[PDB]
Scaffold this active site. Sequence first.
Site, PDB file in Angstrom:
ATOM      1  N   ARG C 350       0.819  -1.226   0.000  1.00  0.00           N
ATOM      2  CA  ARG C 350       0.000   0.000   0.000  1.00  0.00           C
ATOM      3  C   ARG C 350       0.846   1.267   0.000  1.00  0.00           C
ATOM      4  NH1 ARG C 350      -5.441  -1.443   2.596  1.00  0.00           N
ATOM      5  NH2 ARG C 350      -5.657   0.803   3.028  1.00  0.00           N
ATOM      6  N   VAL C 351       2.045   1.136   0.570  1.00  0.00           N
ATOM      7  CA  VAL C 351       3.075   2.165   0.574  1.00  0.00           C
ATOM      8  C   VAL C 351       3.666   2.322  -0.823  1.00  0.00           C
ATOM      9  CG1 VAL C 351       5.441   2.633   1.309  1.00  0.00           C
ATOM     10  CG2 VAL C 351       3.678   1.961   3.007  1.00  0.00           C
TER      11      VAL C 351
END
Lengths: 49, 483, 482, 468
Positions: C350-351
Amino acid sequence: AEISARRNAMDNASKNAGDMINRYSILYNRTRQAVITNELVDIITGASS
Amino acid sequence: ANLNETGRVLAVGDGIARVFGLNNIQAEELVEFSSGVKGMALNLEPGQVGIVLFGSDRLVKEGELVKRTGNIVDVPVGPGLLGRVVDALGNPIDGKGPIDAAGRSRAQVKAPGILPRRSVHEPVQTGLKAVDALVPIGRGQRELIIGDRQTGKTAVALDTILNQKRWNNGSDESKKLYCVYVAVGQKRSTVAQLVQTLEQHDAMKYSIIVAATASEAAPLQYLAPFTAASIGEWFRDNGKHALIVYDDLSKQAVAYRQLSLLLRRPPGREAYPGDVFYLHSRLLERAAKLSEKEGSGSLTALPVIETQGGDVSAYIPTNVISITDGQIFLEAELFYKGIRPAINVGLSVSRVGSAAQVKALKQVAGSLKLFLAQYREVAAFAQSDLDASTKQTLVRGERLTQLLKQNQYSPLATEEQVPLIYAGVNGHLDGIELSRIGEFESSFLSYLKSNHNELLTEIREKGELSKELLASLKSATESFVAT
Amino acid sequence: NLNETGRVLAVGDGIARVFGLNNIQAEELVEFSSGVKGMALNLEPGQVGIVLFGSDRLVKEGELVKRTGNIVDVPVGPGLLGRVVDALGNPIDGKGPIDAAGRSRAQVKAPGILPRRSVHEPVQTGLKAVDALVPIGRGQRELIIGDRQTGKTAVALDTILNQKRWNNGSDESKKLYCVYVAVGQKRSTVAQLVQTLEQHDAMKYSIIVAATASEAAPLQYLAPFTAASIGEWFRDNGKHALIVYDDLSKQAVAYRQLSLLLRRPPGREAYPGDVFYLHSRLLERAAKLSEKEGSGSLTALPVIETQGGDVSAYIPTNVISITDGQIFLEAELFYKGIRPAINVGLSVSRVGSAAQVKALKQVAGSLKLFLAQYREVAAFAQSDLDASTKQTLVRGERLTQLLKQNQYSPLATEEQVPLIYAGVNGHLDGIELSRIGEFESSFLSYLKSNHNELLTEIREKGELSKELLASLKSATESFVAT
Amino acid sequence: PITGKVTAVIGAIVDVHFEQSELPAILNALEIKTPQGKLVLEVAQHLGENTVRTIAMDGTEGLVRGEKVLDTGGPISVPVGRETLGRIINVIGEPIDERGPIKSKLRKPIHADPPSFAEQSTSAEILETGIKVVDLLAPYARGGKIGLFGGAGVGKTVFIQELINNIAKAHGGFSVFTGVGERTREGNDLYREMKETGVINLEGESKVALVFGQMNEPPGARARVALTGLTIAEYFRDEEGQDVLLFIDNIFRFTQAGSEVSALLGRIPSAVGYQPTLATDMGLLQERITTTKKGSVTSVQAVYVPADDLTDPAPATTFAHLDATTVLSRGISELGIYPAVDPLDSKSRLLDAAVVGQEHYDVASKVQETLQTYKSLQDIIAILGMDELSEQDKLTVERARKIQRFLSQPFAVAEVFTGIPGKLVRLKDTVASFKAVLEGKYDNIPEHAFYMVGGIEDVVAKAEKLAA
Ligand SMILES: Nc1ncnc2c1ncn2[C@@H]1O[C@H](COP(=O)(O)OP(=O)(O)NP(=O)(O)O)[C@@H](O)[C@H]1O
Ligand SMILES: Nc1ncnc2c1ncn2[C@@H]1O[C@H](COP(=O)(O)OP(=O)(O)NP(=O)(O)O)[C@@H](O)[C@H]1O
Ligand SMILES: [Mg+2]
Ligand SMILES: [Mg+2]
């Protein structure tokens, strides 16, 4: 003429297995769901005693 | 000292309160607490009384003084209630003053037995082609409405409540059917608009609404259908006709699962208590038709089950279907294709109305049921070859299903449906385009309303058909096929 | 007395019920006449419910119990590097006492909404597939997930082995200290995992908190929090650690044992209500702290073991919904020979973008693209395909081949970017699929001798000039021609 | 000042004793003072013998039996009114943004009564959002509830901020964003991104109050935060009679949390392990989110769907309250369309002719229908080309592209990120614009004019740039 037929036939197979997938998907979730509840009950009852 | 009208809370939690004393109390009797919150006496043990709260637990405290009512759980009943909107305790909530009562029925009354009963025979005209023709509903019959969310389950029910205006208007005391709408687990917003649309169609004047919205206490949402039951029961008793609508039983059942699990009764299938059947059975058994000796009053249950991914086989639905007098299974797949009301034929059945339906229609719809119900398994074996035997019979089942299509808030009269079924099963419309089927429905009634006026009038007076009116209409049909 | 001391009423199944100890705090460590320790978890009207750290054969009815007035804590600080401790901070490797910079409670508030910055520095794992396609940032929480025997530990261990690049250097902000929390593993396994890092000179900057198969459940329950607080030391002190939880499945199983025995009420699969809260607390402690906080960081590699691939399984659900993504393993891909056995389609971070050596992200924005379309025309591998979907199968096989990587040999970034360059920009389509093996070896050693300067710029600049792109291009076309 | 003693500590469940008929009612806030600040305990049951059972709002490590416990004489209460805008608040109404105490004029219990059947709205009504896709296809209920679908990579927060801005700018009502089961990382992002977009204005004025209740917090905390925020929003509808936005992210984890509370309280799980209380729990929450005669609270609630199963109790019970879904989609963002709303999926149960009017309805219907025929033709174009379409078919297809391009809209909040001047499209524009396109009044006009613009007159002016 055969190639056309093979194409059309295979085409309908995909539509049907398509529709079947949909049904079994629904059935899957039911079973999953109950598996959770019936499994849980076994514990609850064991636990009250 | 005198713990005989009174007791004190020993402990309260999870919607129950265990009261000390109340020695003269009787089971199922009502109780009031220090802050006016009504409870009910569930079980009576030596030492304490288990009391179920009709409300938030916050409104009670351990220590509080508890008074008896001497009343078993009960409601205001009688003529006055109509055009008003009440909660599970017949408490007025539209703010239109106090409830005008005739008396007070218990929410727990027993069902009319084997003897005071009479075979259902007067039709309840729903104005809905698919219904009236195929799964018709008599007065006293108990017909289920069972579909997935967003299928037109209320639509069906609401529309019936609308249609009665033809009858509830006139002098005729026996043609009248009053409406009771229970609103179990619904939204406050949904009910408002549902009252609005009942006032927008005037049907308020002749209907009572009881609602226990999704915020209210579990035992309110549970007690609601029962108290509505008694409210309706008054009419069935005083020689009149009433139509109760249980919307829905699935949310009622769920409230029961609540209490039952907080009272720590073992969970059965889908965590439901073993008595969830008896809940609905003992409720529906009250919707009923009476014998000539008991005034011949009648009360018509239209419960609503809501299924899950189309599942009929579920533990609640089965229970209710094994209670009711048939069901109107509304299938989503049809409703997604724009077929409305989306009645699955081979899964809907009226069990006792096929002898209660208006003659005229039954004559003109010979077997229409299993025609369409076995038409569905055929058209679902095509996507093979050109077979002008079952291909010919296809041109029908499509124009026929196209013919049941009913736009919402469109209540048709019997005399208007009969000619359409005529042309349906007599095939006067096969040469008319598939996208001109419902369009013609409007064109044809325009044609009949100022020509063959008596055909409508006589089917409206008799409700029967002689061979006299058969050929008399078999001239008005092929006439409009040419013009 | 009874305010500082108690009497065992009963004992069994790792639990002992004790009378008194009236002044005891919730989660206070206590000590028994026999010397076994335990902690008090249920504080009930008449009795305390203490969980044991050792065999309850040691405990008898009527025995004396002493408060230690102490919430479970642990020694923390760099005197721990290269050490193998149990979950209470004890040395289990025959190397004398730990030199603790201090002590931290096993339980600690996660850094709030305010004292965090956005994740922005890479954790370079050395694994081509991971670094290129599932980029991990510092402070992130990437979850390693798969069935048994798929390769989960291998992924973590290669991250650990790959830190020598910096840990041996000088620059603090660029080093990364390793913390491997072993839960309910065969001691011989742990022993061997030790013998493996020492064989790569990785021990010197790693910490093993060991809560092996056979130890009291409390220790297996505690170890990850215990080790969590060890990591935060580095986080709080302007440094960077990364912490591998092997595994959370088994920690949850442990928590379960305690609860059921304490007769706390069970839910789904007999876990207590707060099993989520267990893991949320753990993983929320991982972060990238803001400049004001020393800008230190803690990264998390929880291991989660699916059963027949069930991501809906109770525990995997909780954990998946806490983490910032998953590295997903499958024995299918594994027996095909694709190791690491990373399902690319199922793995997300997600980063993502924000945490990638800009250079690797430069020659790979295309890589997820190509391998996506290769997954969709895959079944076409069985006679009459048009040149477009023929081509797609030509990259895919080679690309997939390029992301195989023998164990223990993680690659330097400046060593990844050339291979991923020659791949994506179509310099392998000519080469046959079996030679992609020896291709990598010979390319890199050639690039080392004849182009060490471009490699150096990548390693130093971390980005690619318009010139560097023609440099690499030219050096490649030269090697591919040769 | 009412005082008790801690008699039992079991995870987040604490038991407190009292003196004769001083017992606080259920749903009261009890405080224990800690070295840090204060631990809050909510009352669940009177167990008898003057004892109450509570659920903690924080950890309970270090509690000793027989410890002082103060009764607040109320439920948990929050600061309300203007003083909360641009503030970060937690479950127990405390500033957590280190900018002093919120100096509110009142405080209000997080537990309250849904507006009686009297105070009800008799008519459903559309809330204008200014977003073309939304208003035209999936229009919002005023005082309604909208299920927002989609994870990351779809500009969820940008879109949320757009609505906060547009509800403030076009209507004139504030917004309350509630983080239920928050990932803390995203709380730090959101908070920064909001400042960066200036919907929060530390120096000037904010349009949004922030109430976070993250994962790491214990089950009691995570259950109540929704109410904590809702209470705040309910003040702006009753005191200041506004049309407020209440955001809930994520309504599912609220459910989840409510389950844990039930398990810890030792109650028997319902079906699929959910709380037996699940329906009424939702009801109590949702039934306060609604229109009154004073004003309205409309809610946008992020909805996660467990195991992708729309029949699981959680979503099942939730959908029971939604009036419109807004589904953003990866497919839609990838095609460059922003917002990434799926025009086909995002369905509003308030798009009926009788309630949006005929002209609105007919347009939208035909719009979906246009896009429907296009969607199914995507595949025959990719085998035999657009040489395989009749006159009527190829007409709508070349047109549907222009429609699928006109649905995208540049945002005012995304202006700092993109620099492109953002447009709020008043709903009548959305109607007449899409009306004129459907008849074929803008066919000679190319496709890149309709992409990223205001109304139809912004297509007109942009195509004149693109012409000469
Ligand atoms: N015959 C019809 N023609 C046109 N629209 C219809 C028809 N029947 C139902 N609808 C519409 O479809 C929606 C579903 O109606 P509804 O009466 O609520 O069905 P339902 O199964 O009871 N849905 P719900 O009660 O929310 O689970 C309504 O909003 C109606 O406007
Ligand atoms: N890239 C690789 N190349 C070759 N072998 C590998 C690779 N990764 C793992 N292995 C081997 O495959 C086996 C499985 O790896 P392993 O790290 O044990 O996965 P795991 O999830 O930790 N299995 P376990 O945790 O014991 O249930 C080990 O025996 C390794 O020797
Ligand atoms: Mg309905
Ligand atoms: Mg392993």
